[PDB]
Amino acid sequence: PVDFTGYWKMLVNENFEEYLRALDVNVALRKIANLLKPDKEIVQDGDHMIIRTLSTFRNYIMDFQVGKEFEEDLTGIDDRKCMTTVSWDGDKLQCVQKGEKEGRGWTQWIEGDELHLEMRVEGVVCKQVFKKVQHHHHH
Ligand SMILES: Cc1ccc(C2(c3noc(CN(C)Cc4cnn(C)c4)n3)CCCC2)cc1
Structure with a gap:
């Protein structure tokens, strides 16, 4: 069993520029984006994530709902849309993003107080790790 609910702060972000390059993201935007240390706010509500x-x-x-294919609008990221399914793989979430790019997806899991996220496309891999935090951020 796993529950991703929480507020999470980025600790590391490995190889993100090459991942965005494989998505054909403009190099100006790659540089802006790799400077970012985003937070993640997650609510797991049954299988509704x-x-x-x-x-x-x-x-x-x-x-989205785990197990249910949906149309994922990635306009803000690489100007594409995928047909995406996020499924349980034991205590991991396994996402496949069907579309123009081959081998596009990600895996998210927890180890202790760390949220781990591996994102992949065309054989290029980026790994992020977040730490669970308790000071909440108004948005
Ligand atoms: C050109 C561009 C790159 C990157 C982003 C952000 C971004 N960074 O990553 C993602 C979404 N995917 C690529 C990875 C992901 C995030 N959560 N999950 C489960 C997978 N956008 C950084 C902060 C949020 C916007 C936005 C725009």
């Missing part, structure tokens, strides 16, 4: 990734540049909001 809300993952709010919050930064001073752009936010990215996910709101």
Whole structure:
């Protein structure tokens, strides 16, 4: 069992620029985005997940049901739309993002007080780790 509910602060962000490059993100935006240390506010409500990734540049909001395919609007990220499914893989969430790019997806899991997120596209891998925090941020 796992529960992702919480407020999470970025600790590390490894290889994000190459991940965004593989998504054809403009190098100016790659540099802006890799400077960001976003927070994540997550509510797991049964199998209804809300993952709010919050930064001073752009936010990215996910709101989906585990196991149910949906249309994911990535206009703010790489100007694409995918047909996405997030599924349980034991205590991990496994996301497949079907679309133009091959091998696009991610895996999210918890180890202790750490939220781990590995994002992948076209064989390129970015790894992020967040720490669970308790001082809440008004948004
Ligand atoms: C050109 C651009 C790059 C990156 C972003 C942000 C971004 N950083 O990552 C994501 C969404 N995906 C790529 C990764 C992800 C986040 N949560 N999950 C489960 C997967 N947007 C950084 C803070 C939020 C907006 C926004 C715009």
